[PDB]
């Protein structure tokens, strides 16, 4: 058809209205920048609202604390894939960030003496791991994420932030190596909007829906990740995906390990408590990834449950119902609402479930998006990223609990501060070519009228199952290679898509097909990166490569060792690229940043084992 | 009293049982975070 | 809820500029695309059952129910019985949603539906 094209000019455009995007947009607008915020959802429907837990900051309200101890915990948790300059930045800023959020109106819970109440969480420690549990985790009642969104969205409006609500960003407007804005679809009326700006912030969230089981809202489709890929820019560490072992089958709702702490057990199709064979001491309270791998082996060997023999059972019905009702109030209701299960007589169907994407768009600690040219890091002019879509990398190979609301506010603010320090409101906005974005519109039109042999639903499910079966917790060469072939085959299937809705008013069919394209790019890079990485580090663990492969053997004194060349160890970030036309994946690597922002303020933590 | 936890005297915090009592963060048996 | 009292957001408005087909299509999107999986699943399934069959009055009641509240969790708790809904939401559509969430026939509500129900007949 014909596509009405509308042009806009802003100082800055933020793609995303979750915690990260709202913090960036509010920050820019408060600083005087004419700021647009493009979001495919009303802002409080962002997945940030799902966060009913907390946010870490070393306020020291319950004991003496030091943000440098939070730095240490985060570095160690990252398994030394985390960039220590970004982790320094984030943990040093967190105390002020949380107090600022309270000042903005977030009603953080309080101690009897008026301080922000804090909980132990995430394995956090005092005195660089030597001093017992730290209490850093702060919250707003049972709705920290919602409070964050409501507060930042509401405050942004006082500074005239311009929202494009239910607009779907299709691509970046790149010209000669610089970002000049974004091209987006108005979902309500089908018009195409080219939003020009001197600076663009990508804050689009995760890509959990590449898998069959994830905790994400159904909006988590990797759209900004894919825009980066389509610009020929690298994504980073996409193989590092954090899983929980006991999500409800299909739904992805995580069931608390408290069910197993109270005596719940995992059962296979033969009625066996199989965790006794994989973890004779810890049994069903073995570590997350041990449990997930054990479940997967059971399923792979034909002992999975259900009609497709593709999950296992979490059995609670041997426990006294009084115990369930008293110690786990609500588990009966949750299991009934989604699985239709009465936990006093039926098991819950469960399987390992994606919860967090450590990987994403590589940035420096300022939120500036990086390319990797001639083996050197180099910022992309006019382009920023923050939040779960980004890879700063504060989480490295494993995110700590309650650090993932923190990175939203720290790096959302960092993007705004970086723009404020390098630019002024009203600076000339770079022009774009009159046909800029044409290819995005061509792709949209092809999907709108797609009349092939594979429906969006069919390709989507096949992708999700293939990722679940080949690129989840259980990783080994032969299975990863099989999965690489499958995902490459499904990428080729995008050319055979079948859609149905040919209109342009609230065309959810079309939007979910764009989302599938984006997911498929993310899936390709995740599984090829995982196949290439022949080591175990944090959430990536391989049955054929069970050891963390660093530049030294850090299990032994370093004195007298020969350092391994960069190309012969794995303590390095994966960089992934896709030739969109052919589906060809290319991998490169860049070093982990071990230097902090200031060694005198915060010492680099050497890798340890 | 309405919004004050009788045990910890936390004000305006999570309702019902302590969400982190098992080490993760749970609500109604759902694991929110870990 | 101090932040929500001191920081009020733009109010929800019933829309009068939409054909019934447009309103149904918008509420489909806004049912499927929620901030947590719980309401993505429950509201996408509820929408499949009802949107194409509702009257305009029912659509407007549903619109207010799922789109006026700032917090998806408030809707989820109203529907699953953990909290009572404000009087503005006490009507037949809320009654339908509350009864649906109870899952009295112990069905599996584990996935949002594929969209073919809108376009193809079941063979
Ligand atoms: C169920 C759950 C519970 C969690 N609980 C906690 C917790 O207690 N504590 C914690 O620290 N972490 C928690 N996490 C992790 C943390 O909540 C998330 O990592 C974080 O909220 C992500 O925020 P974000 O701003 O990066 O993205 P999101 O909040 O996902 O927002 C992404 C934004 O991008 C927009 N967008 C996406 N694609 C497009 C497009 N194509 N066009 C336009 N706009 C687009 C969306 O509309 C949305 O506004 C939880 C995660 C989940 C899934
Ligand atoms: Cl053991
Ligand atoms: K990430």
Residue numbers in the entry:
A (entry chain A): 53 to 661
B (entry chain C): 75 to 108
C (entry chain B): 44 to 166
The authors write:
Respiratory complex II (CII; succinate dehydrogenase, SDH) connects the Krebs cycle with oxidative phosphorylation, making it a master regulator of cell metabolism. Although data are limited, the synthesis of a number of findings suggests that CII activity is regulated at the level of assembly in some biological situations. This may be a relatively complex process as mature CII contains four protein subunits (SDHA, SDHB, SDHC, and SDHD) and houses five permanently-associated cofactors (covalent FAD, [2Fe-2S], [4Fe-4S], and [3Fe-4S] clusters, and integral-membrane b heme). In eukaryotes, CII biogenesis involves at least four SDH assembly factors (SDHAFs). SDHA maturation requires FAD, dicarboxylate, SDHAF2, and SDHAF4.
As a result, mixing SDHA-AF2 with SDHAF4 at 4 °C slows SDHAF2 displacement and results in the capture of an SDHA-AF2-AF4 intermediate. We purified the metastable species that formed from a mixture of SDHA-AF2 and SDHAF4 at 4 °C, crystallized the species, and determined the structure by X-ray crystallography. This identified an SDHA-AF2-AF4 assembly intermediate. Here, SDHAF2 and SDHAF4 bind adjacent to each other on the surface of SDHA. Despite adjacent binding, each of these assembly factors interacts with SDHA, but not with each other. As relates to the control of maturation, the most striking aspect of the SDHA-AF2-AF4 structure is the decrease in the intrinsic disorder of both assembly factors. In the SDHA-AF2-AF4 structure, both the N- and C-termini of SDHAF2 strongly interact with SDHA, but the additional ordering does not involve a significant increase in secondary structure. However, when in complex with SDHA, the C-terminal 34 residues of SDHAF4 are associated with clear electron density. The ordered region of the protein, comprising SDHAF475-108, has little secondary structure and contains only two short β-strands. Extensive interactions between SDHAF4 and SDHA involve strongly conserved residues from both proteins and hinge upon intimate contacts between the two C-terminal residues of SDHAF4 (SDHAF4D107 and SDHAF4F108) and the active site SDHAH407 and SDHAR451 of SDHA.
